Design a protein around this ligand. Structure first.
Ligand code: ZZE
Lengths: 412, 557
């Protein structure tokens, strides 16, 4: 049912994406063929020729409470070459303050709006084949594609119309749209909250988009976990040394930190195991620092012109710590992630879970995804991330070698 | 023929126009050849004479192949190619034999005069203009233009490919249980039908292709197994590498060793055990290609071991989609790993080897994991699934390492296999300070200008020592200092450094390094019974570190 298409434009000089397709399992290839031959019949996508030199990677995932393969297109390159995405969506500051936030997939809506004829070329993707027997199956989009930041930007107009009645009826409810999802926050009792979401799904239903008691977030119960200073009766040189290092480091973040009194204890070439009684003076400094570490961090402020960065550390025992900043040490947010009953034997599984959780929080707090620094081997992550990935979006990532100390500093 | 297939719309790069490269004046003989060649092509619709309007031109040439007095027409499309749009990419990989499914009957059909049987977009033909010059730049030359995909044009491989895909589609739909592999101008067909029906299915295919302008060989013209395909020898039930001949030679050149390593790496696909590490070592620094390189005792042994392996012809089996894939890995030596993939115990579909990471400080556990990863990737590419692993590492060793390492790691379903040498960790750092063990506070410094440096320690038992180092770095002194403390310590030691660098290296339990020093440290760490390593920030009122920083810094700014 075409309408007047919104003319899209790449950044001046910037050219379309030409990203290689990574090998997929037969299982996923089969699933994508089935999905795509169905989207073709529905006119959402159509086959393309070799005169289309563009390519975007494609995968197959399965969301939580879902046993039906879903197509996930990695538009990260196209997204970076677009904006346009010009007329963006404003991020509400009230969302992070709501007692509860519900995430709703509204991606099925995008398939109604036709995509600008002259832009279609850039949405090209390939379904690969095993052992390269057959050349890849090539298609492009005719309708707004899921995963492209241009789709929500274009769909704003229609989304506001859809939500207008619900908005006027519940003006205290916060609605934020980010990519294929809707974030709905209220301060209501969990019962009313869920009732209001159900009502919202009906509104969406009237517009052809079946939006299925989704993941429930509680941004109120989100509290930045401190750096954590030990609490012992007797201390060794090793413990004070471990403490001095930790504080020395934290002093780079929180200015008010002092270490002169504690350091005074560490004088002479003593054995690491020697017990050392702490001077009443060091006791204060210590306690005083713990107080500082309880509170946020004076000086750090979100700068919307700069990228968000997230670092993750493997703590062991299914535990993971993470930090979000724009400039190193200037932590806008720190947190933890403990393996949920099941991943009792998988690091990659836990890391993908942790990445999705952190990304979700970023979207809620800043309306932006962070650039990840992953403590893993590229090829390993490349090989397995899709096995446990359930988000409709994909953040930017790089692979790093965790500095051993950083693990301790944030260790709990 | 010329396929009746709809053409692919082609265009030049945005801010560009067609080529306008002048014709070089050509020899009388070369001009004669072009005229006849072009007359033939013109008669077959491959090319067409053009008006004076067309302002485009691309140089034309003529060369004759030896042992024959038959001329060939060469067009230099370098310019048009720079002006032609970018296309897709024919394929992301070449089929690997090991991935070929077992089928009772297989046929190879090559598409004859491939590129020339496919039409070119009419709106683009104008840009393919070429000129046969007149004897001595007399008057206008005979001007032509292509109607089909020109040999050596940028878009030909891709356009041909697509045209074949479009052509094969209906036949694919009506015959889902037949495998067709598209490779350049070739076409391989497989079925599980008894000859009779298969030759019928082949014939039907050829008829579908011919109905579309593509000629193929008929029965008596089709190749017969063995098939010599892209370096391989294909038989209906097995495959191998094209006969490999290891040159018997006295005095080897860089070029000779290069080709040797090439053939060996190539043979590694099916011949298990091939070692190349010692030969690659000779190729370090090289500086020349004709320079002869004397073979080390180790390379001679390696080469001899390879000959033995290659003396016995080995074959690979084909893929059965119903059975699981099993990959086994073995340690061949220092950073050397081999693997084999089979479905039925010891009937290999494929072989391979692994020997990465230039000694950036590693251990056998990290290496094994890397080899598993590499194997996993290729399995997905070749078979669309991951194999079940058989590893020479204890589940206990594995869990101990993974749980405690800082990087997330994960091996798919694997099973321990008692195949020595087994993978293990050679030493382990203590989790907490050792009571009644001397504490060495180490440190190292190095002058940036002079490259001179000092390394040393001071203990809790009041000991002290400071070594002077020449042509050093800060990194090297920090590692030298730790090495010193390990030398003068004995069985149990607590070591406190200010170097995150050294702490990082040692913590990863390395057993191999490119650094002679790190090897000293490893060798020393293995001898110990207990070792605890701690870190402190430098330049602080921290007893111990504050002091070693004095003697090590004195005389070295
Ligand atoms: C379906 C194609 C095919 N399957 N098999 C397994 C038989 O059980 C073989 C071995 C003979 C094939 O032949 C090729 C011949 C040539 C040639 N020339 C190339 C390839 C490829 N790829 C394949």
């Amino acid at each position: 049912s075409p309408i007047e298409t919104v003319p899209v434009k790449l950044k001046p000089g910037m050219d379309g994406p030409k990203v290689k397709q990574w090998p997929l399992t037969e299982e996923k290839i089969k699933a994508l063929v089935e999905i795509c031959t169905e989207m073709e019949k529905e006119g959402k996508i159509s086959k393309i020729g070799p005169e289309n030199p563009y390519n975007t990677p494609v995968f197959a995932i399965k969301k939580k409470d879902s046993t039906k393969w879903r197509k996930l297109v990695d538009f990260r390159e196209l997204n970076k070459r677009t904006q346009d995405f010009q007329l963006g969506i404003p991020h509400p500051a009230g969302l992070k303050k709501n007692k509860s936030v519900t995430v709703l997939d509204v991606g099925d809506a995008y398939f109604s709006v036709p995509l600008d004829e002259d832009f279609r070329k850039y949405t090209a993707f390939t379904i690969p084949s095993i052992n390269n027997e057959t050349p890849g199956i090539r298609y492009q989009y005719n309708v707004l594609p899921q995963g492209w930041k241009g789709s929500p930007a274009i769909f704003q107009s229609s989304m506001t119309k859809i939500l207008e009645p619900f908005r006027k009826q519940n003006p205290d409810i916060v609605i934020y749209q980010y990519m294929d999802d809707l974030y709905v926050g209220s301060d209501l009792e969990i019962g009313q909250h869920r009732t209001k979401i159900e009502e919202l799904r009906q509104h969406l239903l009237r517009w052809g988009l079946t939006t299925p008691m989704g993941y429930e977030l509680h941004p109120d119960k989100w509290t930045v976990q401190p750096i954590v200073l030990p609490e012992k009766d007797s201390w060794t040189v090793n413990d004070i040394q471990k403490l001095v290092g930790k504080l020395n480091w934290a002093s780079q973040i929180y200015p008010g930190i002092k270490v002169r009194q504690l350091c005074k204890l560490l004088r002479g070439t003593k054995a690491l195991t020697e017990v050392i009684p702490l001077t009443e003076e060091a006791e204060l400094e210590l306690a005083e620092n713990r107080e500082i570490l309880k509170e946020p961090v004076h000086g750090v402020y979100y700068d919307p012109s700069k990228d968000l960065i997230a670092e993750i550390q493997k703590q062991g025992q299914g535990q993971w710590t993470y930090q979000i900043y724009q400039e190193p040490f200037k932590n806008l947010k720190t947190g933890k992630y403990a393996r949920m009953r099941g991943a009792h034997t998988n690091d990659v599984k836990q890391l993908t879970e942790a990445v999705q959780k952190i990304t979700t929080e970023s979207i809620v707090i800043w309306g932006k995804t962070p650039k990840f620094k992953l403590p893993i081997q590229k090829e390993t992550w490349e090989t397995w991330w899709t096995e446990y990935w359930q988000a409709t979006w994909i953040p930017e990532w790089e692979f790093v070698n965790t500095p051993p100390l950083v693990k301790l500093w944030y260790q709990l | 023929p010329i396929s009746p297939i709809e053409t692919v719309p082609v265009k030049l790069k945005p801010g560009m126009d067609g080529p306008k490269v002048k014709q070089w004046p050509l020899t009388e003989e070369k001009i004669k050849a072009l005229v006849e060649i072009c007359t033939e092509m013109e008669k077959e619709g491959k090319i067409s004479k053009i008006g004076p309007e067309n302002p485009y031109n691309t140089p034309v040439f003529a060369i004759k192949k030896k042992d024959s007095t038959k001329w060939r027409k060469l067009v230099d499309f370098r310019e048009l190619n720079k002006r032609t749009q970018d296309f897709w990419e024919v394929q992301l990989g070449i089929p690997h034999p090991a991935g070929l499914k077992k089928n009772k009957s297989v046929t190879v059909l090559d598409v004859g005069d491939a590129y020339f049987s496919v039409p070119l977009d009419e709106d683009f033909r104008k840009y393919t203009a070429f000129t046969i010059p007149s004897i001595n730049n007399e008057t206008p030359g005979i001007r032509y233009q292509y109607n089909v995909l020109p040999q050596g044009w940028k878009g030909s491989p891709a356009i041909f490919q697509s045209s074949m895909t479009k052509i094969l589609e209906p036949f694919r739909k009506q015959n889902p249980d037949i495998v067709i592999y598209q490779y350049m101008d070739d076409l391989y067909v497989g079925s599980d039908l008894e000859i009779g029906q298969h030759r019928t299915k082949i014939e039907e295919l050829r008829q579908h292709l011919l109905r579309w302008g593509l000629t193929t060989p008929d029965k008596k013209h089709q190749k017969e197994p063995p098939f010599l395909w892209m370096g391989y020898e294909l038989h209906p039930d097995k495959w191998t590498v094209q006969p490999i001949v290891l040159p018997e030679k006295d005095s080897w050149t860089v070029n000779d060793i290069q080709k040797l390593v090439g053939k060996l790496n190539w043979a590694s696909q099916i011949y298990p055990g091939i070692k190349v590490r010692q030969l690659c070592k000779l190729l370090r620094g090289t500086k020349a290609l004709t320079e002869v390189i004397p073979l080390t005792e180790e390379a001679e042994l390696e080469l001899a071991e390879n000959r033995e392996i290659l003396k016995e012809p080995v074959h690979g089996v084909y893929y059965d989609p119903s059975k699981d894939l099993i990959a086994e890995i073995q340690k061949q030596g220092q950073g050397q790993w081999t693997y084999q993939i089979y479905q039925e115990p010891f009937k290999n579909l494929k072989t391979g080897k692994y020997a990465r990471m230039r000694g950036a400080h590693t251990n056998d556990v990290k290496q094994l994991t890397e080899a598993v990863q590499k194997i996993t990737t290729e399995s997905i590419v070749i078979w669309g699934k991951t194999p079940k692993f058989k590893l020479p590492i204890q589940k206990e060793t594995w869990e101990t390492w993974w749980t405690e390492y800082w990087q997330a790691t994960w091996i798919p379903e694997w099973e321990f296999v008692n195949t020595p040498p087994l993978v293990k960790l050679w030493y382990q750092l203590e989790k907490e300070p050792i009571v009644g063990a001397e504490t060495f506070y180490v440190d190292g410094a190095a002058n940036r200008e002079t490259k001179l440096g000092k390394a040393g320690y001071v203990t809790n038992r009041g000991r002290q020592k400071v070594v002077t180092l020449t042509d050093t770095t800060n990194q090297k002194t920090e590692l030298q200092a730790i090495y010193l403390a390990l030398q003068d310590s004995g069985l149990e030691v607590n070591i406190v450094t200010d170097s995150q660098y050294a702490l990082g290296i040692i913590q990863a339990q390395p057993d191999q390094s490119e650094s002679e020093l790190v090897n000293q440290i490893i060798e020393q760490l293995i001898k110990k019974e207990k070792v605890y390593l701690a870190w402190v920030p430098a330049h602080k009122g921290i007893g111990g570190n504050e002091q070693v920083d004095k003697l090590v810094s004195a005389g070295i700014r």
